[PDB]
Design a protein around this nucleic acid. Structure first.
Ligand SMILES: C[S@@+](CC[C@H](N)C(=O)[O-])C[C@H]1O[C@@H](n2cnc3c(N)ncnc32)[C@H](O)[C@@H]1O
Lengths: 33, 225, 260, 129
DNA sequence: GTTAAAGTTAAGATGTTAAGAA
DNA sequence: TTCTTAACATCTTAACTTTAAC
């Protein structure tokens, strides 16, 4: 969730990539219901 | 959970703002001319060792320096990133060097085969240096093993030709490097200091390298490098 | 406190290893004292052992006393003397490859290595002069286990006289002898492959009584079945060639001496 | 003689055998690539590629521009990250679906820099609204 | 409210050995 | 069937939390 994405060993551009991925998934959820 | 995860959406939008600002600042510093930890006298090559042709390296070195390499380091990706114990030997080390040294790092499972490899290329076994792993408190870092608890990494030194000249100072450094673990498979930086004590002002070649070391005056063949 | 020191924290098995006294009952210890292994016949004083020890003083330089590889070339080892055992031999790096192939021709495959890192007592005394009791002999440091404080142990290694990377090491090459039928009973990991041992300058080729107890105990724990317990009477399964006077007469060992 | 000073020597080796993404002009280490992880550097070839690709193709949809592109190390998130600077503004919602040539892009970039400087809130060339 | 003892856990370039794919 | 090859076989240290005083 919010912690493993915020990991320091994770590179910042891939932090952006996976973090955008869960934004897309959650806004798809709000599109669903 | 609609309103709660809407608040979570607002949270990750604040994360968008913070992270975009952070990366924009770092990239603007990059374009401003920020210098990495790498030194300016590093010669890297990003190509597979079994794929590249070393004759180009040979005549490039002969054109730009007039001599051959002084030290050929290698920390092979041993078979236990896979390679083999024939493809490592078949590559042309005996042409890459004429009068110098070779450091081949070996595990306890690949000792006899490494000695045979070094003796086949024309070198004669002369010395061995061992990395002794350490903990943050200073105790020996012992782990795994079958007959004993392993806390060791070996490396064997083979000499091709003559050594009695201006370079290659005798009776230097020590063969035991007591140092902490700093990676999954990452040799210490004391070995490079020992090398620079051994052959000052040299043209070193290192095979199977990573971006961790990339030192000065080093030719740093690798692929993920 | 001794915990903070790096030297005294690395050297704390010394108080936990006291070698036992000399055997007396004449059943425990065996002596086959003779003139030379390469001269005498073997595999008739013993048979089917599981732990072979060769305390070898390699000559390296021709002027220095010792022996060279041709004695090991002509060494009398058969399937009767050792069939399933593991052979322990002291090795250098000038003749490491030579030792490896001369023991490869007999079937002994290298399986593991066990080294000892030297720490000089003279170096400790000199460093304690250079930093500052401390008016005693290095051998007395080896005996009393009185180790002067040192938080950086990498400076205290011995200073050799090599023509290459300076020598601070002591290697025991152990080589398996595969049989695949009778097998070997062993416990795995109750020994570290490194132990930092205190030495003396101008004499690095001598491991003390505590280091000898350490290596003997790791042999004995590495091969539990060869321990003297109700079945090794006449079935010792352990000997040492080129035996020394210290710590070799042992309950369950055959001490192969060398008469002049 | 001279004991082979290593600056221009290493420059010549990097001209000869090293990768093209490590040496620029005659001799340069290209430090911008050794501080970033492998596979993501945004080479000047990529810079000119998206600079010529933002025109003659529908902006907003980067899948269709990446289908005709290398289809390699061209992940979308880096594209929306680095197209902002070509615009000069972080927000793209007001700049969706319209195509602008490069010189006017630099003009509006300079205008955004000037308005950020006058609005004393610029954070390293980046303007927020 | 602070200090110390007990449970935990995660990592450390092992190897022989029964099983089975050509 | 046969040699490999997956496919299984346990010990120290440093830190982190949890609980019992006091
Ligand atoms: C085990 S690492 C040794 C790195 C060294 N210990 C260091 O950290 O400086 C071996 C490296 O060799 C490279 N390598 C692996 N397989 C290779 C291959 N087949 N050809 C060329 N290079 C290879 C990879 O970069 C890999 O990380």
């Amino acid at each position: 969730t919010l912690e493993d994405i915020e990991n320091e060993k994770f590179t910042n551009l891939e932090i952006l990539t996976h973090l955008y991925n869960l934004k897309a998934e959650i806004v798809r959820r709000l599109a669903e219901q | 959970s609609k309103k709660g995860l809407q608040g979570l959406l607002q949270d990750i939008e604040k994360r968008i703002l913070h992270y975009k600002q952070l990366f924009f600042k770092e990239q603007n510093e990059i374009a401003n001319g920020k210098r990495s930890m790498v030194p300016d006298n590093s010669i890297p090559i990003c190509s597979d060792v079994t794929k590249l042709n070393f004759q180009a390296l040979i005549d490039a070195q002969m054109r730009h320096a007039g001599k051959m390499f002084d030290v050929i380091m290698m920390d092979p990706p041993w078979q236990l990133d896979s390679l083999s114990d024939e493809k490592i030997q078949n590559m042309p080390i005996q042409s890459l060097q004429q009068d110098g040294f070779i450091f081949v790092w070996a595990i306890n499972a690949k000792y006899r085969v490494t000695i045979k490899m070094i003796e086949n290329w024309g070198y004669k076994l002369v010395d061995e240096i061992t990395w002794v792993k350490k903990t943050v408190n200073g105790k020996i870092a012992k782990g795994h093993g079958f007959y004993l608890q392993h806390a060791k990494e070996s490396c064997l030194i083979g000499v091709k030709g003559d050594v009695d000249n201006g370079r290659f100072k005798k009776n230097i450094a020590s063969d035991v490097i007591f140092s902490e673990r700093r990676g999954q498979s990452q040799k210490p930086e004391e070995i490079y200091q020992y090398i620079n004590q051994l052959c000052p002002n040299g043209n070193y070649l290192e095979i199977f390298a990573r971006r961790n070391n990339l030192h000065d005056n080093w030719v740093s063949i690798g692929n993920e490098l | 406190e001794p915990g903070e020191d790096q030297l005294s924290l690395l050297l704390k098995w010394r108080s936990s290893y006291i070698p036992p006294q000399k055997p007396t009952n004449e059943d425990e210890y065996k002596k086959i004292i003779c003139k030379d292994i390469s001269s005498e016949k073997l595999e008739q004083h013993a048979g089917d052992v599981s732990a072979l020890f060769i305390n070898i003083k390699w000559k390296l330089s021709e002027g220095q006393s010792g022996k060279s590889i041709e004695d090991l070339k002509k060494l009398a080892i058969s399937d009767k003397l050792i069939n399933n055992g593991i052979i322990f031999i002291w090795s250098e790096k000038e003749i490491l490859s030579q030792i490896v192939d001369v023991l490869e021709a007999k079937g002994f495959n290298y399986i593991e290595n066990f080294m000892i890192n030297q720490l000089s007592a003279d170096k400790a005394l000199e460093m304690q002069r250079k930093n500052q009791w401390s008016d005693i002999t290095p051998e007395q440091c080896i005996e009393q286990e009185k180790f002067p404080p040192n938080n950086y142990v990498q400076d205290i290694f011995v200073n050799s006289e090599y023509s290459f990377f300076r020598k601070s090491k002591k290697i025991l090459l152990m080589l398996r002898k595969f049989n695949k039928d009778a097998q070997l009973e062993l416990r795995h990991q109750r020994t570290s492959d490194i132990f930092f041992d205190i030495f003396e300058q101008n004499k690095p080729n001598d491991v003390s009584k505590k280091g000898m107890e350490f290596v003997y105990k790791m042999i004995e724990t590495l091969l539990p079945k060869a321990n003297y317990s109700e079945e090794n009477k006449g079935a010792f399964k352990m000997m040492e060639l080129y035996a020394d006077d210290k710590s070799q007469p042992r309950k369950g060992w055959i001490s192969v001496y060398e008469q002049e | 003689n001279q004991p082979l000073d290593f600056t221009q020597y290493a420059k010549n080796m990097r001209k000869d055998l090293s990768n093209q993404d490590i040496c620029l002009e005659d001799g340069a280490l290209n430090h911008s690539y050794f501080l970033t992880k492998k596979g993501q550097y945004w080479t000047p070839l990529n810079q000119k590629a998206l600079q010529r690709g933002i025109e003659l193709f529908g902006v907003g949809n980067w899948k269709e521009i990446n289908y005709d592109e290398f289809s390699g190390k061209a992940n979308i998130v880096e594209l929306e990250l680095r197209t902002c600077m070509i615009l000069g503004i972080n927000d793209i919602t007001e700049y969706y679906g319209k195509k602008i040539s490069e010189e006017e892009q630099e003009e509006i970039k300079k205008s955004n820099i000037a308005k950020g400087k006058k609005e004393n809130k610029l954070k390293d060339n980046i303007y927020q609204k």
